[PDB]
Amino acid sequence: TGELKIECPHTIGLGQGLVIGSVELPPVPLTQVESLKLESSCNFDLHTSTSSQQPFTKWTWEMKSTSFQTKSSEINLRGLCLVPPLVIETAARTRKTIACFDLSCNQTACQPTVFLIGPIQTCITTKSCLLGLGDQRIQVNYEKTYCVSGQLVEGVCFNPVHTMALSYDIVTVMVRCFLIAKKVSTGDSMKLEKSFETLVQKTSCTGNGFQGYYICLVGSSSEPLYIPTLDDYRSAEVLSRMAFAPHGEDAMRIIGKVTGKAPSTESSDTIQGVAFSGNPLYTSTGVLTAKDDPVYIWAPGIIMEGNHSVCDKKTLPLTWTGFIPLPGEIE
Ligand SMILES: *[C@@H]1O[C@H](CO)[C@@H](O[C@@H]2O[C@H](CO)[C@@H](O[C@@H]3O[C@H](CO)[C@@H](O)[C@H](O[C@H]4O[C@H](CO)[C@@H](O)[C@H](O)[C@@H]4O)[C@@H]3O)[C@H](O)[C@H]2NC(C)=O)[C@H](O)[C@H]1NC(C)=O
Numbered sequence: 001t002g003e004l005k006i007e008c009p010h011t012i013g014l015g016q017g018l019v020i021g022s023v024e025l026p027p028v029p030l031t032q033v034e035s036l037k038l039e040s041s042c043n044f045d046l047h048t049s050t051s052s053q054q055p056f057t058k059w060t061w062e063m064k065s066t067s068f069q070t071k072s073s074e075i076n077l078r079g080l081c082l083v084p085p086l087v088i089e090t091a092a093r094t095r096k097t098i099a100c101f102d103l104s105c106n107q108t109a110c111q112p113t114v115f116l117i118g119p120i121q122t123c124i125t126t127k128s129c130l131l132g133l134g135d136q137r138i139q140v141n142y143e144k145t146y147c148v149s150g151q152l153v154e155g156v157c158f159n160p161v162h163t164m165a166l167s168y169d170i171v172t173v174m175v176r177c178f179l180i181a182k183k184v185s186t187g188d189s190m191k192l193e194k195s196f197e198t199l200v201q202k203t204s205c206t207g208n209g210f211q212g213y214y215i216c217l218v219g220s221s222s223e224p225l226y227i228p229t230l231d232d233y234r235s236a237e238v239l240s241r242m243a244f245a246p247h248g249e250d251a252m253r254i255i256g257k258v259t260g261k262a263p264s265t266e267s268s269d270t271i272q273g274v275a276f277s278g279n280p281l282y283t284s285t286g287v288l289t290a291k292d293d294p295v296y297i298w299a300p301g302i303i304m305e306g307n308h309s310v311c312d313k314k315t316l317p318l319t320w321t322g323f324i325p326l327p328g329e330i331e
């Protein structure tokens with residue numbers, strides 16, 4: 001039994017906050033990954049979006065005798081954290097709970113990371129409940145916070161700044177973000193990879209057309225944070241940490257550079273990365289930055305290219321976990 005801890009605040013407050021928790025489970029063989037279904041015995045209202053079938057290009061490597069053979073094909077996965085637009089943003093109002101997983105994989109095995117997001121009211125209704133994923137049971141524990149006004153962060157009770165203007169103590173908090181595909185008809189407002197390129201590039205990249213955004217939750221509970229929100233200091237912070245740690249923040253053995261075709265029907269290579277063996281470390285899921293219409297990739301045993309300074313064959317991860325410093329008061 002794994003443990004997914006939810007830190008519950010003393011009050012609901014302004015209504016629009018969500019709780020979030022997550023746990024990384026033990027390795028399962030690859031052949032079992034396509035069968036994985038999240039089950040819930042919990043007394044909450046599961047959003048059905050994530051358990052539908054979702055098309056991915058599977059990209060894999062084998063030793064050959066540069067010394068690699070890669071290949072790819074299109075498959076359907078279910079239960080992954082591909083959250084539709086507005087679902088997280090309006091979950092406090094709809095009273096919907098999002099439960100989904102990401103995959104961190106080597107060639108032969110995957111560690112699912114289960115994410116649970118939902119309304120703060122769940123803390124009134126629920127002390128503990130169970131999720132299942134394949135053969136693993138997950139104990140969700142809702143636990144009331146030691147603090148009076150904030151959250152337990154690095155063993156310290158902390159409340160961040162709230163005002164919209166400019167004016168403190170500084171505490172480093174966890175941020176968890178989910179990639180959302182969202183197109184507009186006209187212009188470049190949703191061209192997410194262009195935002196990264198302005199932050200970390202010298203010269204002009206021609207074709208990074210992916211349209212979407214990240215939706216993030218800060219700490220154990222917060223209102224959703226949209227990335228990018230141009231004049232928000234927290235958005236700026238998350239983007240900068242993403243730009244320097246594109247596979248998130250926290251033995252794996254690097255073998256070499258690999259390329260491949262995504263989707264597999266492409267005549268030439270559209271993706272690159274670094275093949276590895278040993279313990280999976282980063283998530284193995286992302287989207288090509290080059291296509292407006294998302295091309296989703298699952299690349300077990302390969303760290304797909306996420307360096308924003310590169311122009312071609314790069315990706316954005318489906319989920320991203322890191323840390324940002326927040327100004328506020330320790331109490
Ligand atoms: C992908 O990652 C997975 C998980 O990280 C990894 O598979 C695991 O590898 C370890 C070690 O390579 C396996 O450990 C074995 O566990 C059994 C359980 O009873 C032990 O009995 C074994 O012990 C013997 O082997 C050791 C070899 O050094 C000795 O020190 C020891 O005294 C024993 O003789 C053994 O350690 C584990 O079972 C698997 N896990 C899974 C889920 O299959 C895998 O190697 C990674 N894949 C790649 C391609 O890198």
Ligand SMILES: *[C@@H]1O[C@H](CO)[C@@H](O[C@@H]2O[C@H](CO)[C@@H](O)[C@H](O)[C@H]2NC(C)=O)[C@H](O)[C@H]1NC(C)=O
Nearest residue numbers: 200201202203244246306307308309310311312
């Ligand atoms: C991210 O990508 C850029 C461009 O490929 C890499 O920048 C080069 O890095 C080498 C060694 O650090 C330098 O000698 C080159 O002059 C750099 N070129 C440019 C255009 O900046 C960068 O190292 C990559 N970051 C990684 C792999 O972490």
